[PDB]
Design a protein around this ligand. Structure first.
Ligand SMILES: Cn1c(=O)c2nc(N)[nH]c2n(C)c1=O
Ligand SMILES: Cn1c(=O)c2nc(N)[nH]c2n(C)c1=O
Ligand SMILES: Cn1c(=O)c2nc(N)[nH]c2n(C)c1=O
Ligand SMILES: Cn1c(=O)c2nc(N)[nH]c2n(C)c1=O
Ligand SMILES: Cn1c(=O)c2nc(N)[nH]c2n(C)c1=O
Ligand SMILES: Cn1c(=O)c2nc(N)[nH]c2n(C)c1=O
Ligand SMILES: Cn1c(=O)c2nc(N)[nH]c2n(C)c1=O
Ligand SMILES: Cn1c(=O)c2nc(N)[nH]c2n(C)c1=O
Lengths: 121, 121, 121, 121, 121, 121, 121, 121
């Protein structure tokens, strides 16, 4: 099964970061979420109830990215993946990518970050 | 076999959507279509008859994206995949991606959507 | 005097629009603000008090773009220009540009909108 | 008066061109339209009747770009400018820009084209 | 072995096409070439003789894209793949992608095209 | 008179440069050309003879950018402006912009260059 | 005289900022420099001595952007403009633009900043 | 395990190259680094000590890209991969991509380069 649902380039202003100054000032975090879901029934019925609603998905992502400040990107991505899988049975697997296009790194790069893939149990 | 034929970034203005206001106003839908096809004969002969004509492919995609208004993206992608496979034997498999870069989602993201891969029977 | 202060590409999700469906669903509004201000003293002193603070400027723009829903872009731009000039004497003139990259217009365009220039009285 | 209304990046597939092969095949034409209009009343009242409706403007542009095939870009831009000024008194002046990003020119360039500014009489 | 050598976004103005008008006028063709090659020796020695020279590769691609006019993209990609493999033993496999961002297709899309992967015999 | 004709982003691979190594290796030069021309007659008649043909213009630019290697950008832009004005009476003024996006400058910048405006005598 | 010399998109990682946390962490500053200079002699002679060398210009900009940490953008732009005019007589006027694409501003915008134009005395 | 850590679009100005003129003048090298690392513990603990610090990673990449001049890209990528794996046990595998967007290649392409994947021993 290679069907997916996606939310690309979501961006949030949060105060996460290991450096005290990071949590003080804050920055923009870019998030990509890809969910493994079978979409043939929904594609057959045309009934939004036979699939996963993204607006809802976006609400989960948001509430986490714009919530309490944490240290690592790995913690935010793990809270999002775990949160999405717990609420939706149809999501067979969840992939979370978080990019920090402007970390406290003296240099020229397009962005830094992490990505994780969490299968639904 | 890893050969493909592609039509990237096709965009259509349709009135699909689960929200009544969506079907009223309308929006732009971006579509990516990748077809699995063996192109060595055509690459050998140089005869357009030994391959799949995209302009035709685009016509199928268009007629569906700019046709009657439906509820889900999964329905549009399933009508396109099913329609392409039924008309072309050379297409061993069809992948359809539809992006809604501006859904009724209060936030900042690059786009939301779905993707499906339908092997030809 | 050709010095300016600028805030480019600010984007807000608001429910402004003349069509009822527009106010229902909402969309993203992109805003560009250019202020006429003499920056030689501040450039000489290096004292933020001798110039106009943008973060503050952004707060004014935001509070208007993300406030009550209105009909026209001309009303939002006029509320922003009038609001910026009333609060800052150093701003000799204010230019406001608002773009609706996705209005209820069946077609392919990069965006539509208005721009106004309001000298400070 | 430096207020304006704009429609940027409109794109149409038309068959205009001096070369017979151009009119046969066709291409995409990108159009930018900037109208000189006083928007303080509309910005004051918030009444769409006190300003120029772009969707209407876009309809005029479209009907010309997607109408009969002509030879020059100068003819299309002159038909659009003349057409916009004749229908709207509030438009003090109209600027039309048409770009042919893919003319029959053997080379590497981003695009070619013309621009005209037509004051309303 | 997942090492590769690449030449991305090469663009050529050629007169290939099935439509007579296409061969008359011409257009820009974008080409992506990815070659499978083991680069540890060259990465170890730092000797350009232990690897595949791209400038040479580009010369082969060019001479084909800017040579006699043919009908299909599949023919150009097959002439390039076959030509690269015949001249270089180190290339274990060659992938050719050709995009026609402006074919004679009445519509709005980012580009159309084909891709092929040819293992070296 | 604010009408213009334009050729944007033309790019050529030439060996111009003050540094011997520059003339040896070569680089890509990006060129923008804006010509002042009255386009109302041509816009009225639709006759390409009542205006300035760009393809021709591009040929002049090309023959200079891809010709003998010189030292300065100012020399190339002056040869182009002077060449365009001498051949076309309708061009009331010519503006030439040449960008070196990759000069021998150790740093991170989008590009360097010059621009000149030459009225036709 | 409308000739200019330009350096666009220069970017530097500096620790300037009014907020202590800003000077601690640092960020990327984007700089645009446009110099008013008559380039007809240099365009006539082709002698780099009859014009202003940008690499040198870039060195001045750099040494200031990557030097001691200051409070305002207005101070950096004033040090650059003043520094360029003092060293080059041919520069009739200097324009400096500095953008902070990621200031400590909780929001979504493309960038904030200032611009100044300093005529040479 | 499909988790990764990434640093995309890092760019450095180095003097590497097989052509003497290349080492003389220099150019910008773009680097992409993807590291295979298990991020569930760190995602669970939120402790930066349970993962690989990128700023450190960037320092290794930098010191190599901005160090002594070498001949091939394969040598730089092999020094980076080997250097990252030797210093971090958590990195199960390292992928290095280096692009030369402006090599001494007379043509129009987006960039050329190599990529390697080095599993950690
Ligand atoms: C905030 N933050 C992170 O999340 C992080 N994750 C890794 N792997 N390294 C990190 N650093 C340095 C950091 O500052
Ligand atoms: C129109 N529309 C869809 O097609 C859709 N598909 C999914 N999975 N969720 C959807 N929502 C919320 C929607 O409004
Ligand atoms: C919401 N809205 C506007 O603000 C507007 N301003 C002009 N000039 N025309 C407009 N239309 C059609 C609209 O729907
Ligand atoms: C279609 N077409 C034009 O409109 C045009 N306008 C100018 N000035 N030159 C032109 N050429 C060559 C052309 O083919
Ligand atoms: C020039 N040309 C092609 O190469 C081609 N290849 C496929 N598969 N279809 C094609 N058409 C319609 C075309 O015009
Ligand atoms: C090739 N080249 C130029 O054309 C040039 N023009 C100015 N003003 N400065 C220049 N330098 C340094 C250069 O190398
Ligand atoms: C660092 N910094 C500035 O340079 C600045 N310049 C203006 N006008 N406002 C500014 N703020 C808020 C700031 O933090
Ligand atoms: C500097 N340099 C390289 O690193 C390289 N690597 C390959 N495979 N070919 C190369 N050429 C031509 C070059 O000039």
């Amino acid at each position: 099964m290679q069907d997916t649902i996606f939310l690309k380039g979501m961006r949030f202003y949060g105060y996460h970061g290991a450096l005290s100054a990071e949590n003080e000032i804050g920055q923009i975090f870019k998030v990509d979420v890809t969910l493994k879901v079978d979409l043939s029934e929904a594609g057959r019925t045309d009934n939004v109830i036979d699939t996963v609603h993204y607006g809802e998905v976006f609400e989960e992502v948001k509430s986490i990215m714009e919530g309490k400040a944490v240290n690592l990107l790995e913690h935010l991505a793990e809270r999002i993946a775990n949160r999405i899988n717990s609420q939706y049975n149809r999501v067979m697997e969840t992939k979370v990518r978080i990019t920090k296009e402007n970390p406290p790194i003296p240099g020229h790069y397009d962005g830094v970050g992490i990505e994780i893939v969490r299968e639904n149990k």
